[PDB]
C-alpha cells in the first residue's frame, strides 16, 4: 500500500544521514579493547586450579 | 500514480547507503590483526553435568552471581540450579509445556519464561510465605515468544513470532512501547551494557538497532543470506555477532554500520543455534546443529577449539559475568559446564 | 542483501508465448531450490513450478505441465520459465521465490502472504 | 564452618525433596502420548476436536491410556520455525479436505505442505496420520458438472480404481476413483523416502463420530510396535 | 589319572583355558561398557549386566576346578569343597537360565503391549526379577546338596559312582533328576520358546504388510535374530539335560568322557551369551568403540 511504502522511504531517509568512523578505526578499537582486558579472561588463560571453583568435586 | 515511484526512491536511497558504506570501508579487520600472534589451542573440559530434565532444553540463563542458573525444557519445568555441588534450588512447573525462552532478573528475585502460548510469565522467587508462584502474565503478542530479557525488576523487553518487539511495565502489565519494522519472525535479542539500546535478528536476514526510550529503529544491518538465529553484543557495546542458517557467523559494528568479519568453514554446512562472547571479547563461542560447539578467534576468524560432548543438537549457550565457566544445553536434556 | 528481480512478461494474444526471467543476487545461487509462484486477481498465491539445486528434479502443477518449462543457469544466476502456450486463465503476477535454507529438500513458506525471499513480480495478461 | 555445614545440609535436604517430586512426575510424563493436530482453516480441524490463545490443548483417554493433542492457533502461516518443537511427538495428524479439487487449488497446497513436513530434517522420525474429510462433498461435486479433476490433475483420466480397494456399498465408481487417486497422490510422496523410520496411515473420514479416536489409537499402537520391532533388529 | 597322552592333554588344557579367558573377558567388557555410560541405564540393561555378572561368577569360581577334575579325573581338592563347588555350579547355571527367561518376558512386553511398556516394565519389577533369579537358585542348590536330598533313597549307587570318578560327580536319582530338569531347564526354555514364536509371527506379519503397502503402487530379519538366539541356547543346553534326565532310567550307562563333553557344552553358553545379547545390537558396538577411542 501507499502508507507502508511511505514509512519505508521515511525510514530509509532517516538511516541515510548518519555519521561513520571508517573500518580501520573500528578495527583498532576492537584490537585495543581485546588487548587491554587480556589478563581478566580466565577462559583465554587457564587459571590455576587452586582458585578454580569447579575443579574440586 | 505514486506507486512504482516510491520503489525507485527506495532504490536510490539503498544505492546511496551502499555507496556511503563502501566509501567508509577503509580496510579489513583481518589486515590490522594480521600481525597479532594466534591464540593457539583452547582445550576445555566438562566439569559438571546437570541431570533431571525430561524433554529437550531450549533455553538457559546465568545469574549475576555466576553461581546460579535457570533452564527450561519441553517437559514443563523451570529448574534453578546451583552450579556448585549440582543442587536444585527450585523447580517451577509451568502452565504451558511449549516454552521456548527463559530469563533471570539481575536482582535475583524473578525469573521469566514463555513460548507458544503468546504469554510472558513472571515468577517471584522470594515469596514471603509458601513457594514460588506466578506474579504477572504479560498478554498482547499475537505470536509465540522467542526471547525476553529484564531491564530491571519492573521492565522487560520481549520479542515475538509476530515480527514485533515490545517493552512492558510489570506493575501494570501494559506495553510501554512497541517496536516495528521487521518483516520476518524475530528470533533473538541482546541488551547493550548501558541498557539504553538493544539489537534483534529476524527471519529476514536483517538485524536492527533499537532505542528503548524513543522506540525507534536507528540502524539496519544486512549481509546474511538466511534466517538469523542468535545475536549477542560485544563486551564494550560497540559491536555484535549473529548466527544464521547459512552456516555463518558475522561481526557487525554499530559505528561503521557494516560487517567486519565472517566466521565460516567449508566443512560446516549446518545452521548456528546460539552464540556468545568471552569476557574480554577475544573468543567467540557458537553452537551448531552438528552436535558440537566451536571456539572462534574473534580477531583472526580461525577456529581454536571444539566442545564436543553432546549427543544431540546444541540449543543454548552461556558465559558467566565473572567469566570462568561456560554452560551448554542440548536436545539430549543435559546441561554441561565447561571450564 | 538478497534481491530477486523478475523481467519479461506483458500482453500476449491467446495461444502466444513468453519467457520470464529472474535475476538473483546476494546469495550462492547453486545451493538453493527455486520456485515459480503467481497470483491471479481475486485469488491468493499458488505454487506453479520448482527446480532442484542442479536441475534433476522438476515439478509442475497439473494446469501447466506439458506447456510451461522451468530452467536455471547457475553460472549467470538466472531462473527461466518458457510459457509455450497461454490461456485466458493465465493472467496473473509471477514471482520467483527462493528456498528458506540451503542443502534442504523442503520448501515451507514460499507461498505465504508475506515471505522475505520473493521478488517484486511481473504482470502477465492475455485478453484477445 | 558450622554455619557452612548447616546451610549445606539444608541445601541437600531441599535438593532431595525436589528430586522426590521429579521422580513422581517422571512416571506421569512417561505414561502419556503427545499428538500434533495440523490442518487448514476450512479443511477440518474442528470436528476432530469436537469428538475429543497461542495453542489449544485437548485431553482424552481410551483403554486407560492418556493422549494429549495440541491444536495450534493464533500463529502465522509461516510454520518453518515453530514446527521444530514437535520432533518427538508420537504422530502428527494431518487433516485435509479432499473435496476442494476445484488460490482455490487447495489439494496441491496440501500436497506441498505434506512433502515439506515429510522431508524436514527434524521430523524424519515422526509418523503422520492422514485424514481426508468431505468425502460426501467430494461425491456431490463429482456427480454434478460443477467442476472436474482433470483440470488440476491431468492423470485422473488414465487412472482406474485398484482391485484391492474396498468401496462401501452403494458408491459410484467415479467418486471411489477420485478418493483413491488422492490417497495415492499422498502415498507417492510418503513412500519415496520412508526407509522404515516413519510411515503414513491414510483414512477416509466422512461423518464418523468416535471412530476417529479409535483409528488414532490403533495407528499409534502400530507406530510404537514398529519402533520396538525395528530397535530389536526384527524389522 | 587317565589313559591319555601328554600332547592331547596339553592341547585340551589350552582349549579350556581359552574358553575361560573368553568367558571372563567378554562379560567384563560388557559390564564395564554398560556401567560407564550413564545414558545406557535402562531397566533392561540392568538385566543384561546381572546376567553378565552370573556368567562372570561361572567363569571365575566354578570353571577352573571343573577343568582340573575333568582333565585329571581325580579331584585333588578335598571333601567339603566337593560339596560347595557342586552347589555353586547349579546355583549359577539356574540363575543364568532364569535371566534368559526374564529377558524374553521383557521383549514380549515391549512388542505385544507397546503403549503400556514403559509404565509396566520399570526399575522396580526388574529389581524384583534380579532378586528372584539370584535368590531362589541359591536356596534350591544349597538346600538340595548339603541336605543330601539328591541321592536320598539310593546310596550304594551314589557311593560306587563317586568312587568310579575321583572326587566329584553330579549325581541325581529319578525323582531328583526329574525335579531338577523341570526347575532349571524345561520351564524357562518353554517360556522363551513360546514368547519368541509369537514375536516371530508378529514380525513376519508386519514385514508382509509393509512390503505389500510399499509395492502396491511403486531380506527377513526376524528369522536370523530369533534363530541365533534360540539355537545357541538349545545346542548349548539340551544335550546335557536330555542325557541327565534319562541316565537314572538307564542304570547310569553314560561314559565319563560323554559327561565331560556335555558339561563343557553347557559351560559354553556363558561364553556365547554376551555376544548374543550385547555385541549383536549396533548401539552397544558404537558405545564400546567410542569408549575405546576415548582412552587412546
Ligand atoms: C552344567 N552344570 C551341571 C554340572 C550342574 C547343573 C545341573 C542341573 C542344573 C544346573 C546345573
Method: cryo-EM
CA of E109 to the centre of ligand 1 (A): 30
Residues 6 or more apart from A31 whose CB is under 8 A from it?
Answer: B32, B33, B36, B299
* Contacts D33 to E, Cβ<8 Å: 115
What phi and psi, each to the nearest 5 degrees, are found at residue E210? -65, -45
Do residues E30 and E248 make contact, with C-beta atoms less than 8 angstroms apart? no
What phi and psi, each to the nearest 5 degrees, are found at residue B102? -150, 155
User: Are A22 and B42 within 8 A, CB to CB?
Assistant: no
CATH number at residue A38: 4.10.260.10
Q: Is E86 in the pocket of ligand 1 (CB under 6 A)?
A: no
- Which chains are within 8 Å of C by 3+ CB pairs? B, D
User: Are B185 and D78 within 8 A, CB to CB?
Assistant: yes
- Grid look-up 502466444 returns C16
CA of E227 to the centre of ligand 1 (A): 24
Q: Is E192 in the pocket of ligand 1 (CB under 6 A)?
A: no
Show the domains of chain B with their CATH numbers.
Answer: 1-338 (2.130.10.10)
Burial class of residue E135 in the structure, from the number of CB atoms within 10 Å of its CB (0-12 exposed, 13-18 middle, 19+ buried) = exposed
CA–CA gap between residue D152 and residue D142 (Å, rounded) = 14
Interface list for B 183-222 with D (CB within 8 A): 184-185, 187, 203
What phi and psi, each to the nearest 5 degrees, are found at residue D30? -75, -5
D88 reaches B (C-beta below 8 A): yes
Instruction: Output the CA torsion D23→D27→D32→D34 (10° steps).
Output: 20
Q: Write the secondary structure of chain B as one string of H (helix), E (strand) and C (coil).
A: CCCCCHHHHHHHHHHHHHHHHHHHCCCCHHHHHCCCCCCCCCCCCEEEEECCCCCCEEEEEECCCCCEEEEEECCCEEEEEECCCCEEEEEEECCCCCEEEEEECCCCCEEEEEECCCEEEEEECCCCCCCCEEEEEEECCCCCEEEEEECCCCEEEEEECCCCEEEEECCCCEEEEEECCCCCCEEEEEECCCCCEEEEEECCCCEEEEECCCCEEEEEECCCCCCEEEEEECCCCCEEEEEECCCCEEEEECCCCEEEEEECCCCCCCCEEEEEECCCCCEEEEEECCCCEEEEECCCCCEEEECCCCCCCEEEEEECCCCCCEEEEECCCCEEEEC
Q: Which chain E residue shows the shortest CA-CA distance from D231? A: E281
User: Are D27 and E206 within 8 A, CB to CB?
Assistant: no
Out of B87, B96, B142, the one facing D15 most closely (by C-beta) is: B87
In this structure, the residue with its CA closest to atom 9 of ligand 1 is E90
B290 reaches C (C-beta below 8 A): no
Q: Tell me how crowded residue D159 is: count the other CB atoms within 10 A of its CB.
A: 14
CA distance D6 to chain C (A): 55
Out of B93, B116, B142, the one facing D82 most closely (by C-beta) is: B116
List the one residue out of C2, B14, C18 whose CA is nearest residue C10. Answer: C18
Task: Return the ∠ at Cα B289 (arms to B287 and B293), rounded to 5°.
Answer: 30
Do residues E244 and E177 make contact, with C-beta atoms less than 8 angstroms apart? yes
The CATH classification of domain D34-231, taken from the options 3.40.50.720, 3.30.110.60, 3.40.50.11900, 3.40.50.300: 3.40.50.300
Q: Is E246 in the pocket of ligand 1 (CB under 6 A)?
A: no
What SS3 state is found at C9?
A: coil
* DSSP 8-state symbol, E269: H
Q: Is domain C3-106+118-123 given the CATH code 2.40.30.30 in the classification?
A: no
Do residues E71 and E16 make contact, with C-beta atoms less than 8 angstroms apart? yes
- Domain residue limits, chain D: 34-231
What phi and psi, each to the nearest 5 degrees, are found at residue B113? -160, 165
Q: Which chain B residue shows the shortest CA-CA distance from D56? A: B117
CA–CA gap between residue B271 and residue B290 (Å, rounded) = 8
Point out the ligand 1 atom lying closest to the alpha carbon of residue E266: 1
Q: Which chain C residue shows the shortest CA-CA distance from D83? A: C108
- Which chains are within 8 Å of E by 3+ CB pairs? D
B142 reaches D (C-beta below 8 A): yes
Q: Do chains B and A touch (3 or more CB pairs under 8 A)?
A: yes
Interface list for E 22-81 with D (CB within 8 A): none
Q: Is E226 in the pocket of ligand 1 (CB under 6 A)?
A: no
Q: Which chain B residue shows the shortest CA-CA distance from C112? A: B184
Cα within 13 Å of Cα(D144), Cβ side:
9
**How many domains, in total, are found in chain A?**
1
Show the domains of chain E with their CATH numbers.
Answer: 6-294 (1.20.1070.10)
Amino acid at each position: 500500500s501507499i502508507a507502508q511504502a511511505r514509512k519505508l522511504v521515511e525510514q530509509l531517509k532517516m538511516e541515510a544521514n548518519i555519521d561513520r568512523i571508517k573500518v580501520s578505526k573500528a578495527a583498532a578499537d576492537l584490537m585495543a579493547y581485546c588487548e587491554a582486558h587480556a589478563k581478566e579472561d580466565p577462559l583465554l588463560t587457564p587459571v590455576p586450579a587452586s582458585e578454580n571453583p569447579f575443579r574440586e568435586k | 500514480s505514486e506507486l512504482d515511484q516510491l520503489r525507485q526512491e527506495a532504490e536510490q536511497l539503498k544505492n546511496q547507503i551502499r555507496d556511503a558504506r563502501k566509501a567508509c570501508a577503509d580496510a579489513t579487520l583481518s589486515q590490522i590483526t594480521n600481525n597479532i600472534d594466534p591464540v593457539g589451542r583452547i582445550q576445555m573440559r566438562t566439569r559438571r553435568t546437570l541431570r533431571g530434565h525430561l524433554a529437550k532444553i531450549y533455553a538457559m540463563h546465568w545469574g549475576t552471581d555466576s553461581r546460579l542458573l535457570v533452564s527450561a525444557s519441553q517437559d514443563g519445568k523451570l529448574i534453578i540450579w546451583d552450579s556448585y555441588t549440582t543442587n536444585k534450588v527450585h523447580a517451577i512447573p509451568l502452565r504451558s509445556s511449549w516454552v521456548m525462552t527463559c530469563a533471570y532478573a539481575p536482582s535475583g528475585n524473578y525469573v521469566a519464561c514463555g513460548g507458544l502460548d503468546n504469554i510472558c510469565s513472571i515468577y517471584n522467587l522470594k515469596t514471603r510465605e509458601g513457594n514460588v508462584r506466578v506474579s504477572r502474565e504479560l498478554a498482547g503478542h499475537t505470536g509465540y515468544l522467542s526471547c525476553c530479557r529484564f531491564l530491571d525488576d519492573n521492565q522487560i523487553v520481549t520479542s515475538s513470532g509476530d515480527t514485533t518487539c515490545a517493552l512492558w511495565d510489570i506493575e501494570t502489565g501494559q506495553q510501554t512501547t512497541t517496536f516495528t519494522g521487521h518483516t520476518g519472525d524475530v528470533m533473538s535479542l541482546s541488551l547493550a551494557p548501558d541498557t539504553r539500546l538493544f539489537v534483534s535478528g529476524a527471519c529476514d536476514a536483517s538485524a536492527k538497532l533499537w532505542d528503548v526510550r524513543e522506540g525507534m529503529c536507528r540502524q539496519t544491518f544486512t549481509g546474511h543470506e538466511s534466517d538469523i538465529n542468535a545475536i549477542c553484543f560485544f563486551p564494550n557495546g560497540n559491536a555484535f555477532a549473529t548466527g544464521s542458517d547459512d552456516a555463518t557467523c558475522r561481526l557487525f559494528d554499530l559505528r561503521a554500520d557494516q560487517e567486519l568479519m565472517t566466521y565460516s568453514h567449508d566443512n560446516i554446512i549446518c545452521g548456528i543455534t546460539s552464540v556468545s562472547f568471552s569476557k574480554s571479547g577475544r573468543l567467540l563461542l557458537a553452537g551448531y546443529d552438528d552436535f558440537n560447539c566451536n571456539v572462534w578467534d574473534a580477531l583472526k576468524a580461525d577456529r581454536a577449539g571444539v566442545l564436543a560432548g553432546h549427543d544431540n543438537r546444541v540449543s543454548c549457550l552461556g558465559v558467566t559475568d565473572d567469566g570462568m565457566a561456560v554452560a551448554t544445553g542440548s536436545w539430549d536434556s543435559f546441561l554441561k559446564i565447561w571450564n | 542483501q538478497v534481491q530477486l528481480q523478475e523481467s519479461g512478461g506483458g500482453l500476449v494474444q491467446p495461444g502466444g508465448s513468453l519467457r520470464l526471467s529472474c535475476a538473483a543476487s546476494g546469495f550462492t545461487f547453486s545451493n538453493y531450490k527455486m520456485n515459480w509462484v503467481r497470483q491471479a486477481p481475486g485469488k491468493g498465491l499458488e505454487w506453479v513450478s520448482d527446480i532442484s539445486q542442479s536441475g534433476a528434479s522438476i515439478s509442475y502443477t497439473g494446469s501447466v505441465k506439458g506447456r510451461f518449462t522451468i530452467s536455471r543457469d547457475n553460472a549467470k544466476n538466472t531462473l527461466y520459465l518458457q510459457m509455450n502456450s497461454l490461456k485466458p486463465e493465465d493472467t496473473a503476477v509471477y514471482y520467483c521465490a527462493r528456498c528458506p535454507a540451503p542443502f534442504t529438500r523442503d520448501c515451507f513458506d514460499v507461498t505465504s502472504t508475506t515471505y522475505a525471499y520473493r521478488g517484486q513480480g511481473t504482470q502477465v495478461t492475455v485478453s484477445s | 564452618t558450622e554455619d557452612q555445614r548447616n546451610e549445606e545440609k539444608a541445601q541437600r535436604e531441599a535438593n532431595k525433596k525436589i528430586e522426590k517430586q521429579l521422580q513422581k512426575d517422571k512416571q506421569v510424563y512417561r505414561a502419556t502420548h503427545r499428538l500434533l493436530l495440523l490442518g487448514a482453516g476450512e479443511s477440518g480441524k474442528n470436528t476432530i476436536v469436537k469428538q475429543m490463545s497461542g495453542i489449544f490443548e485437548t485431553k482424552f483417554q481410551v483403554d486407560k491410556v492418556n493422549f494429549h493433542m495440541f491444536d495450534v492457533g493464533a500463529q502465522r502461516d509461516e510454520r518453518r520455525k515453530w514446527i521444530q518443537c514437535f520432533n518427538d511427538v508420537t504422530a502428527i495428524i494431518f487433516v485435509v479436505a479432499s473435496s476442494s479439487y476445484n488460490q482455490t487449488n487447495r489439494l496441491q497446497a496440501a500436497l506441498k505442505l505434506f512433502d515439506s513436513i515429510w522431508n524436514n530434517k527434524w521430523l524424519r522420525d515422526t509418523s503422520v496420520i492422514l485424514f481426508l474429510n468431505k468425502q460426501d462433498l467430494l461425491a456431490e461435486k463429482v456427480l454434478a458438472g460443477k467442476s472436474k479433476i482433470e483440470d488440476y490433475f491431468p492423470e485422473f483420466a488414465r487412472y482406474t480404481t485398484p482391485e484391492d480397494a474396498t468401496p462401501e456399498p452403494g458408491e459410484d465408481p467415479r467418486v471411489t476413483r477420485a478418493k483413491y487417486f488422492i490417497r495415492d497422490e499422498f502415498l507417492r510422496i510418503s513412500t519415496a523416502s520412508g526407509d522404515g523410520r516413519h510411515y503414513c496411515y491414510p483414512h477416509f473420514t466422512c461423518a464418523v463420530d468416535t471412530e476417529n479416536i479409535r483409528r488414532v489409537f490403533n495407528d499409534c499402537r502400530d507406530i510404537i510396535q514398529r519402533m520396538h520391532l525395528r530397535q530389536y533388529e526384527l524389522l | 589319572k587317565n589313559n591319555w597322552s601328554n600332547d592331547v592333554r596339553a592341547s585340551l588344557y589350552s582349549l579350556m583355558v581359552l574358553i575361560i579367558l573368553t568367558t571372563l573377558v567378554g562379560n567384563l567388557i560388557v559390564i564395564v561398557s554398560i556401567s560407564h555410560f550413564k545414558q545406557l541405564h535402562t531397566p533392561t540393561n540392568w538385566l543384561i549386566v546381572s546376567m553378565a555378572t552370573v556368567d562372570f561368577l561361572l567363569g571365575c569360581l566354578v570353571m577352573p576346578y571343573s577343568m582340573v577334575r575333568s582333565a585329571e579325573h581325580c579331584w585333588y581338592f578335598g571333601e567339603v569343597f566337593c560339596k560347595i563347588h557342586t552347589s555353586t555350579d547349579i546355583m549359577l547355571s539356574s540363575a543364568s537360565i532364569w535371566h534368559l527367561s526374564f529377558i524374553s518376558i521383557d521383549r514380549y512386553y515391549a512388542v505385544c503391549d507397546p503403549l503400556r511398556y514403559k509404565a509396566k516394565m520399570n526399575i522396580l519389577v526388574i529389581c524384583v526379577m534380579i532378586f528372584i533369579s539370584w535368590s531362589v537358585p541359591a536356596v534350591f542348590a544349597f538346600g538340595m546338596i548339603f541336605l543330601e536330598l539328591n541321592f536320598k533313597g539310593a546310596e550304594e549307587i551314589y557311593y560306587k559312582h563317586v568312587h568310579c570318578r575321583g572326587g566329584c560327580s553330579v549325581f541325581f536319582s529319578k525323582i531328583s533328576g526329574v525335579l531338577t530338569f523341570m526347575t532349571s531347564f524345561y520351564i524357562p526354555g518353554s517360556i522363551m520358546l513360546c514368547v519368541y514364536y509369537r514375536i516371530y509371527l508378529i514380525a513376519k506379519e508386519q514385514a508382509r504388510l509393509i512390503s505389500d503397502a510399499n509395492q502396491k503402487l511403486q531380506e527377513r530379519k526376524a528369522v536370523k535374530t530369533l534363530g541365533i538366539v534360540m539355537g545357541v541356547f538349545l545346542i548349548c543346553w539340551c544335550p546335557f539335560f536330555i542325557c541327565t534326565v534319562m541316565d537314572p532310567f538307564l542304570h547310569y550307562i553314560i561314559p565319563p568322557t560323554l559327561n565331560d563333553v556335555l558339561i563343557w557344552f553347557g559351560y559354553l553358553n556363558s561364553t556365547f551369551n554376551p555376544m548374543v545379547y550385547a555385541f549383536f545390537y549396533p548401539w552397544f558396538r558404537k558405545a564400546l568403540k567410542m569408549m575405546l577411542f576415548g582412552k587412546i
